Design a protein around this ligand. Sequence first.
Ligand SMILES: [Mg+2]
Ligand SMILES: [Mg+2]
Ligand SMILES: [Mg+2]
Ligand SMILES: [Mg+2]
Ligand SMILES: [Zn+2]
Lengths: 202, 52, 141, 190, 161, 196
Amino acid sequence: GRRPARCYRYCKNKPYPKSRFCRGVPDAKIRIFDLGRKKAKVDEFPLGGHMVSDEYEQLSSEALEAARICANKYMVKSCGRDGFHMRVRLHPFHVIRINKMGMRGAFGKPQGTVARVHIGQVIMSIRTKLQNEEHVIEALRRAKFKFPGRQKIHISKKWGFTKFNADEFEDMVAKKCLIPDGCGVKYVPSHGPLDKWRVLHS
Amino acid sequence: IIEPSLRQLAQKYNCDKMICRKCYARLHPRAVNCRKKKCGHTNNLRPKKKVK
Amino acid sequence: PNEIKVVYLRCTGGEVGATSALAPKIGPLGLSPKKVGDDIAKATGDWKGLRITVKLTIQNRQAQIEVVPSASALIIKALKEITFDEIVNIARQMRHRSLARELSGTIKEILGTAQSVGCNVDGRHPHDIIDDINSGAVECP
Amino acid sequence: MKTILSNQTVDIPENVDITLKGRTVIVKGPRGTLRRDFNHINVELSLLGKKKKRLRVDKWWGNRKELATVRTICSHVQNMIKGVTLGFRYKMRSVYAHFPINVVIQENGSLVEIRNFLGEKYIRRVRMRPGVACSVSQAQKDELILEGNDIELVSNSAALIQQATTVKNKDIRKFLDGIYVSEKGTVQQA
Amino acid sequence: YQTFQRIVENVNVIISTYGEGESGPMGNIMIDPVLGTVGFGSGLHGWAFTLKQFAEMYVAKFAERAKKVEDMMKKLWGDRYFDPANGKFSKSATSPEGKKLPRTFCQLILDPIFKVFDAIMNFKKEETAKLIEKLDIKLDSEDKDKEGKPLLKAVMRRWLP
Amino acid sequence: DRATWKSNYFLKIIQLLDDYPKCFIVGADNVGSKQMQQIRMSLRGKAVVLMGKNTMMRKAIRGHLENNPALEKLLPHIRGNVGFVFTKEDLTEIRDMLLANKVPAAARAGAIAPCEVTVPAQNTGLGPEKTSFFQALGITTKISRGTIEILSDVQLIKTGDKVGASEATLLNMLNISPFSFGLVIQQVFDNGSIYN
RNA sequence: GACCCCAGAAAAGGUGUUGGUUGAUAUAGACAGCAGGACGGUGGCCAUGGAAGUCGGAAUCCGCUAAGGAGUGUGUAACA
Ligand SMILES: [Mg+2]
Ligand SMILES: [Mg+2]
Ligand SMILES: [Mg+2]
Ligand SMILES: [Mg+2]
Ligand SMILES: [Zn+2]
């Protein structure tokens, strides 16, 4: 019922999102993009591991769902159901068409959704305890088999999912350049009202 | 009714071995890679099943 | 053989049961007890313990003295129904004390750790007691 | 990577005498002579002393493929040495479940006759390699004593008997019967 | 002898463990070759024997007939050994010089059968001749002409019905 | 924790060897931990038994004891599976007390047997289900009194040979103690001295 | 194997060889071999037809220790 992924592997069709022009699009296979302990604050999960994809191709929505399940089964089995947070950093926005059965009026109707990646772009993200690095690489290594192209595993120097480096994360939090809320942190520039400096720092 | 000391002697040559999962090749008990090029010396090995 | 020696153990206690006990399988070795011996077997081993109560039985021709080896979890579960600090100390007094022990702080630690399944003195699990073992650590000798 | 030099040395006992003719080692131990050429490899062989009689091989710019042949040669020469001072004796037992395996040793221990293997009517005749003599031992109920000076020939003849008694079309985890090598020792036990 | 011992041991062990009626209500029930309760033979070849016949004939070649043969009945089975050169029994596993001897059962029961079987099976005609007269077996028809296994079929039946 | 443990053993051998001047060089033969468990307790009142890697000992009491020589005579003697028993009382008593604390070790499969044991002809008392074990070794046994019976004493195992797998377990059921050995002293030490 | 278009190949593997990156162990003696020991509470708790280290749910200690997991696998109905 679905064509092989080799028929839509390449980004050659001028991004075609679901809009008022492209209606009647079936729902994408992947609806959940965050798994594990999505509530762990910032500190228990300082280790962030990424799956970057070094090919300009498009990954389908069913492949994104399949790799997410594959990474969830392993991370739960090994690190524990509460020992990790997963974030699929790819959304299947592009819509692929199919010309069902000659060439007259060949413009196809939507059939599925894919996500287009670049040479440097993370597909999946896992934050967890520091001692789970080997388990994170293995979980990503297995989920990589569910994608058409070639991907790399990279242990990011940044603290968890936060955009700030792990070595300096603790000391700016200490001097309150960052405050923790939710899964990430809030940068606090020293250029706002002074009353907001004094409700902090006190 | 084979006496056990000779029974272990025969199993050493018939039973106690590893089998390649890709080409079924009979390999020594300590084999880690298959010795045959037809499978590409794969390390996917399994012990030979016992009759127990 | 001590005029009889049919030493074998059994893993029942508390409720009499008799039929529910595994005694019929263990009966033939002595050839003495049968059903009547089983009934008297649970009579002394009725209470303390009220639990699994593994006992080592020394034979008495027809009767069978049911001396119970003081198993750790057995005595711990028997006492627990909770501080029992002195009660865990006496529970750590009557049993054989081999433990591959050296001093009294050792046995207080080892018996203290065995009762992790059923906690320990009021609001503290029996491990943070194990580190700072000073109170009564030498109260047995 | 090419090593400057890979070499290793073997010691020669007093009783046995080794002479070199190119890459051809000849040993003159008490139990006969053993000769084996090595011209399929490129090493240099030398006798070092006149009193302790040391045999040395060198490799001189080999990669790891041909570095492995330095100790292969020395192992062979040691096998030559042991084969002429102590000889090779491959005891091997015959195990059978139901049908006894009857072995008849024909002329001067060079032909063996496997009769009742799995109760077949086919007689298996296997010819020992030259210089290898097989026999039926008196110590054990049923086992072959095939002795010799060359380990390659003795072990190959032992393999000829072992592969001759192979159960076909049956489960070989059962039907464990046949003749297999039990121990590999020497003669004179020294 | 070993496999015979293994079987009777296997029969005796299973009699005792389930047949709780040991010495008591029926006495000792276990089979024993020395007691005469076990026999050897082959229904296909129509010949069988027990320790009585060999002991009975050994005495004949050697009322009161009962008592003397039951003691030799005892001697045949078990670990008791017999020295052929000494020509007598011995409880020691080895002769005084140091020559270990076969046990009494294999020595004086199985050897004549093994000699009889091998002679006919290998068609050693002179040996069958010396054996039949040394064994004193009556020669009926149809066997003087037929050799081999059917002849072994005949001589064992006639000797040991 | 490896570096800490190794250093801790250095401190332990240092501050204990400073105290006890009398020692025996004692070899750990095929000696179970459980049976070492009881000698440690059995000597706990009198002495203390300590040992580890023989290289551990060698570097410990060669480079840190330049202050107290006469223990260099331990250096060529600490070889093989060797140990220290650290005693303060008379050597003669702990000598025979060590000899008195012997274990009736069983027969492990694969172990060599330096001692000879042979089962006599006695009534074992085992039930009528263990005959197949005596069958495996060729013992002719008929059952008497509902118990297994050895008709004639049969050789069990000769010195200097390998224990059979089915043989070794048979000795356990018979409860008869096979070859048994434990802690054995080789050399002694007291303020720069060695004896038998 | 052998040259733009071009006339044929992928994912995935290799203890075949070569180079490279990173980490670790090791005279306080690594690695691999050959040889010993591999304990007590405790057949640890809850589940049980029987689950004793090894079908499972959790907990992950203590003492002797050189070291021994309240267990890596084979094995057992459970043991052993
Ligand atoms: Mg198709
Ligand atoms: Mg297009
Ligand atoms: Mg070699
Ligand atoms: Mg078939
Ligand atoms: Zn293969």
